Amino acid sequence: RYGPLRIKELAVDEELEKEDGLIPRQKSKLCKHGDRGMCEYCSPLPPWDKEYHEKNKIKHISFHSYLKKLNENANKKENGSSYISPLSEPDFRINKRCHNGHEPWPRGICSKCQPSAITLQQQEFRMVDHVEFQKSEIINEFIQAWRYTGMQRFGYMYGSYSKYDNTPLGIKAVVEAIYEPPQHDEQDGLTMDVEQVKNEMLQIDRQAQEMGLSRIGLIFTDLSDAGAGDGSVFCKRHKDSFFLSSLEVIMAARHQTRHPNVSKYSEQGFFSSKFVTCVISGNLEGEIDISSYQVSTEAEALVTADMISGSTFPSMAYINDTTDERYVPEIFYMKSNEYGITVKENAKPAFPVDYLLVTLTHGFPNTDTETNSKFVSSTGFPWSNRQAMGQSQDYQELKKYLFNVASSGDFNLLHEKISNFHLLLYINSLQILSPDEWKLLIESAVKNEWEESLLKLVSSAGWQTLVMILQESG
Amino acid sequence: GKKRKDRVVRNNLRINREDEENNMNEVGYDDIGGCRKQMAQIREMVELPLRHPQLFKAIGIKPPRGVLMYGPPGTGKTLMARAVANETGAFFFLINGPEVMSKMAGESESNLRKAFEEAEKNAPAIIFIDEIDSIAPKRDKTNGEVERRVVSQLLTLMDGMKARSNVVVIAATNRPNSIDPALRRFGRFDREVDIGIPDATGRLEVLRIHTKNMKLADDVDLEALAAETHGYVGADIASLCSEAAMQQIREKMDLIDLDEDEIDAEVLDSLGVTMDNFRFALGNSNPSALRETVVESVNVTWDDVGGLDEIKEELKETVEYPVLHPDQYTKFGLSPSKGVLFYGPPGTGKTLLAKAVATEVSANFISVKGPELLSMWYGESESNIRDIFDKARAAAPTVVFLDELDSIAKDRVVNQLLTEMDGMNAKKNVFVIGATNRPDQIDPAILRPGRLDQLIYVPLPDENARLSILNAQLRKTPLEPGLELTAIAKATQGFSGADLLYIVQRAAKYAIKDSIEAHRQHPVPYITKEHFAEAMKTAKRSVSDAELRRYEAYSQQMKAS
């Protein structure tokens, strides 16, 4: 394209790419030179400096810094090339159309369209660094579901991305609300029809985008209470055993491949979706601390061409066999032995999945800093698909929840009782309101400076009809 | 003020304290001596591009980017580069060869790229790649893959920066041959600066600079030390000063106690260096610059060569007129002579004559003794014929004096020398002199046109020449008043200058023996005629009669042609 590709991505990526991240350093005691001029120790530290990370207890290099490293390593300016694109996602599907003279793969294959051996190796750049929950109620209610019922749960989480200063050119995914799809949960697992779930999630995603949110991951609970009198749970997931079994890694890789991250520095324009997966199991103690993970890019491109399946051993993923329409070359997973030497071990039968993960760091915002929460909610109207419990969205619930405040006033109280995710979704499903009426509803509920917008909403006819039907209904 | 600085004010302008005390950098132009020409060249190449870029833009040219700088170790190459960088008052990024070549795989290239990029960012910039021969050595010696990778990275960076940039790269290497040849083309280290051993004035200046803080005693003759010190580079002079100080300490150790932790300041007040300490340091000095070919500086005039007036005027016509009067040659379109070969009995003063010729045109002098040529023939020497001629080109004008040329010219070395001579630029004033004693044995291929075609015979000194040589050799030796040497000169018919020097040596040896005997018995400030008489009685010609006859016959035969 005679230069950088032209394409539009999120604002976070743009602002990150604007910066440089150089970490300044002062005159070391080892320098031998005047004030001006810098030898080798006073030079600015590149943002991708591996020593700085491992010295600061940071395990991966904040993908944007990885992009800076790749751009610096090559692409000399004004000469030397015509901008060979630096990033390219792995692709293991056999080229069905090569034709050096041979026929398609099923009955012929040369040495140019033969997928070469795949060398698994733990990734070094984590696209999304810090997953952050605006309010602990978001996950507290989610766990409360299991508390009441005892069965496991699973839900997508909506939110948006932003900068993260604590890591060089790092990103954080701030989750605002959680949405629960219709699943047939059980004791040891859960089941949910994929087709219906995606059909529902399509319109839920459309509405959320109308609200400004976005789908940025899936969170599920692997919790089993112990026999202790108080609340204690066994820690089945730690260094000794698996972190995420093969099935969860497969599902995470599928989801990541289905939410590509549009970028400007690749041949296809996308790379390594920003889609964090979180799991709740309980730390070594009786707590219910959460975690986070994200499957590496190879596993993302390793499961598009099948080639992986779950295994009875939790921590190992079974490998499939060759057949027409699916060519699976030898897989070598490269570790480092205790003597600091890299060792390649062929793993056709099964290999650990810890080479197909990168870890994140969960957290919560400081409880005495600026609160930019979109929703002051998560304690009120029943959530969507909690039919199994006594929870059930319906007219009488709305009457009991937002009739006394609505009929009198308390615009502060009305606003705080109107900025709830699930309530907004339900009243939207009611269809009692017109398009622009619902637009002003959301702009009043999910925004600051909301006085005139709420006044306009109440002054509208649609809200009057809604409150009238609420009054009519018991 | 000075050194880009802007009693307390004087100290601040240079007109915990340990950090600066041990970091006494900012070695300005006043901390270098004896390299005025090289320093001027470096200043022209560096300051002007950075200080006043508008000149080259007005003319419309691109100033040189790379500035190679090579010479014997210990001549202050790194010090000169640091002084230039500090005086120019411009950003500059150090790179120490061994340091870059002493890091894990895949990081040396990272350091090089970071250096070049950062120097680019803060233009104007001066990147000083020290010991470049340790990161880009000759191809054959270093077949390691990492070395090739580093060399390629350096080449890529060097080529890729020459674009509207105020970055000047300065490199230091022992010899011009060690560096990979790929780093000596256009758009790279094209302009090169050679540094040679200083002359007497240079050594005096170096001693002045180094012996400024030492508490010298009033009885110092630094001029005498400078005259005696020959072949001493600056590092050796610093070592000499250190050794003198240590000798003073050892002498004063009697009045001091080692076990005592404190040392009395009153004793320290008496730490005065003496001439004896400097002479002892000379005794313990180990100069090594001359072990390899180096561009020297000679200061012999037409007074240390007696007689041979016709040869002197012939040499003048052959050498001085081209260099001194190129306009006439251009007018007549005559290419100046490119060499000359001296033949004759050994010890007739060929080397002194060549040194005088070199001094006349005020040009540098390079000596290539026969053992060095044989060592290169066996291929066990650091230098090389190509290296010699490259240094001669760099330090032009120069006179390259091949000595004992018969040994090699009884093959590989002769052919290589012929190729180098043919490839030399005719216009450039660089001359090659040859010394030999077997003109017949010399390969005829050398004496072809465009080569050492001029043949000059050096006869044995005559009576007047012998007298002049005797007078010259005895300039530094005391003599009895009213002592005549005409008798010795006439009695020494057929002797060569070396024989006359041997006679003087023997006479002075007898005189010193007598002085030693007299002192031991306990008077001999002068040399009496008896010493010379006995020495002559114990002296003989070093030239065989048959060789003289054949030399004269050869000269007559050549004249007939």
Ligand SMILES: Nc1ncnc2c1ncn2[C@@H]1O[C@H](COP(=O)(O)OP(=O)(O)OP(=O)(O)O)[C@@H](O)[C@H]1O
């Ligand atoms: N004019 C001078 N010429 C040479 N040396 C000088 C001069 N003035 C001072 N010196 C001293 O001589 C020594 C020169 O050492 P220096 O490290 O500069 O030499 P070098 O061989 O060029 O170095 P490098 O190891 O970088 O090749 C230092 O002690 C310097 O202080």
Ligand SMILES: Nc1ncnc2c1ncn2[C@@H]1O[C@H](COP(=O)(O)OP(=O)(O)O)[C@@H](O)[C@H]1O
């Ligand atoms: N005009 C002269 N003729 C001969 N010898 C001289 C003359 N002037 C000085 N000498 C002495 O002759 C010696 C010549 O030494 P050298 O040049 O090594 O040998 P050669 O003369 O064979 O080249 C010097 O030590 C020098 O003192």
Ligand SMILES: [Zn+2]
């Ligand atoms: Zn430094």
Ligand SMILES: [Zn+2]
């Ligand atoms: Zn093919």
